């Protein structure tokens, strides 16, 4: 397909949202924060684009 610039920004963001919770955030929180629940796989999941 052919993406627009806005679509491109949105896809970019979804990729950024796929990061892990940083190691240092787990230390800062005494492990109260571990999993990223919005974790998305390209195959198994589906975006809104």
Partner 1 sequence: SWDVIKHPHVTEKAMNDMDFQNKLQFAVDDRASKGEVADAVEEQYDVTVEQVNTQNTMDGEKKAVVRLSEDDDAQEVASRI
Partner RNA sequence: ACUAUGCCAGCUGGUGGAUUGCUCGGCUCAGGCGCUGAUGAAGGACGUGCCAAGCUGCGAUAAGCUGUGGGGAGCCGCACGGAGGCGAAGAACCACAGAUUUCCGAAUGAGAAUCUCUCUAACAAUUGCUUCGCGCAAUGAGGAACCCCGAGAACUGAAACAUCUCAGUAUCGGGAGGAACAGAAAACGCAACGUGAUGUCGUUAGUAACCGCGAGUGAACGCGAUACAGCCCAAACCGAAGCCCUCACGGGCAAUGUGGUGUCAGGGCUACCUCUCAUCAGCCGACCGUCUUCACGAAGUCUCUUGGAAUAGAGCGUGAUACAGGGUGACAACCCCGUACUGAAGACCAGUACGCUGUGCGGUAGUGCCAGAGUAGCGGGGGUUGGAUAUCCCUCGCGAAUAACGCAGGCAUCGACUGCGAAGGCUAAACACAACCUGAGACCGAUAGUGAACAAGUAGUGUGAACGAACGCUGCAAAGUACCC
Among 15, 36, 47, 49, binds partner 1 (CB under 8 A): 15
Write down the residue that tokens 């975006």 correspond to: 47
34 binds, among RNA, partner 1, none (CB under 5 to 8 A by kind): none
Which value, to the nearest 10 degrees, does the dihedral of the CA atoms of residues 43, 49, 12, 25 take?
A: -70
Q: Which residue has the tokens 């993406």?
A: 3
CA 17 to CA 28: how far, in whole Å?
20
Contact positions vs RNA (CB under 7 A) = 4-7, 9-10, 12-13, 16-17, 19-22, 24-25, 27-30, 32-33, 36-38, 40, 45-46, 49
Contact positions vs partner 1 (CB under 8 A) = 5, 8-9, 11-13, 15-16
């Amino acid at each position: 397909g052919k993406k627009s610039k806005a679509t491109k920004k949105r896809l970019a963001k979804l990729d950024n949202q796929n990061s892990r919770v940083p190691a240092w955030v787990m230390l800062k929180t005494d492990r109260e924060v571990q999993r990223n629940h919005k974790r998305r796989h390209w195959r198994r999941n589906d975006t809104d684009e």
